């Protein structure tokens with residue numbers, strides 16, 4: 001195992017640790033796509049965790065600075081300030097695929113702003129945050145998952161990412177409230193007669209379901225439109241992308257089965273993941 005193999009193995013472990021949902025999916029990819037996804041995931045995990053988990057703002061500027069170094073001087077040796085093993089992997093990727101650095105910067109800005117957190121007044125603000133935190137990961141992942149880096153491909157990847165974040169939000173309502181976040185819209189909450197602090201304390205009411213279901217329909221419709229345009233990805237990536245997406249669509253059915261609980265984080269079991277993949281691969 002070489003120096004660089006070790007760097008990507010560290011990234012793998014980070015994703016194995018943090019992505020209960022998607023680690024299983026990514027490791028189905030061919031060796032070179034797989035390794036790139038690990039590195040990107042690890043860069044993204046480190047970004048999201050910098051403040052929220054490590055409570056470390058300087059580590060976030062350090063991550064930005066490391067990425068900036070890679071963008072300007074992809075072939076030099078850098079004394080990376082944040083996590084050396086990840087940044088070296090990311091640099092390795094960037095020598096072989098072209099990376100939309102601006103997408104890492106958008107994610108960084110969103111993560112920064114997600115401290116002075118202010119409830120979205122409008123859904124358009126909520127969707128803007130879905131772009132910031134997930135659409136950009138979609139964009140960053142595009143050259144790894146497709147040989148066609150055209151607008152259609154960036155577009156489908158961006159929309160897929162954005163729809164997964166919405167399901168994410170739909171899974172995490174109660175947990176986010178515990179950490180003092182409501183991602184549902186002030187407008188949409190005022191419309192549906194819903195206060196999250198109240199259904200947390202008293203239990204799921206019919207107003208809440210209507211509202212939750214309003215949003216799940218947005219995410220299910222966008223998922224379906226992504227699926228129709230899946231041939232935009234490479235042939236080996238398609239079944240996996242479809243897996244990762246059908247896993248999240250399964251999350252919604254779990255929330256539904258748990259009567260929309262706000263007091264427990266639902267999940268898809270590993271065994272049900274393989275069932276899904278078996279079903280998907282039949283088409284392929």
Ligand SMILES: CC(C)=CCC/C(C)=C/CC/C(C)=C/CC/C(C)=C/CSP(=O)(O)OP(=O)(O)O
Nearest residue numbers: 022025026037040041044045048133137168244
């Ligand atoms: C190719 C393929 C199959 C997919 C790979 C997936 C991939 C590389 C994407 C990584 C993107 C990552 C890490 C996320 C960055 C920002 C974000 C959405 C954080 C937390 S969401 P949650 O609400 O879950 O909270 P908690 O922060 O606790 O995780």
Ligand SMILES: CC(C)=CCC/C(C)=C/CC/C(C)=C/CC/C(C)=C\CSP(=O)(O)OP(=O)(O)O
Nearest residue numbers: 018019020021134137138160161164165168244
């Ligand atoms: C997915 C793919 C390969 C195809 C195209 C590109 C694409 C859509 C990538 C999406 C990856 C992102 C940021 C979208 C959703 C992931 C998400 C909602 C947040 C944290 S992932 P965690 O690790 O927190 O997962 P859990 O909390 O669910 O366990």
Ligand SMILES: [Mg+2]
Nearest residue numbers: 048049052053
């Ligand atoms: Mg976090």
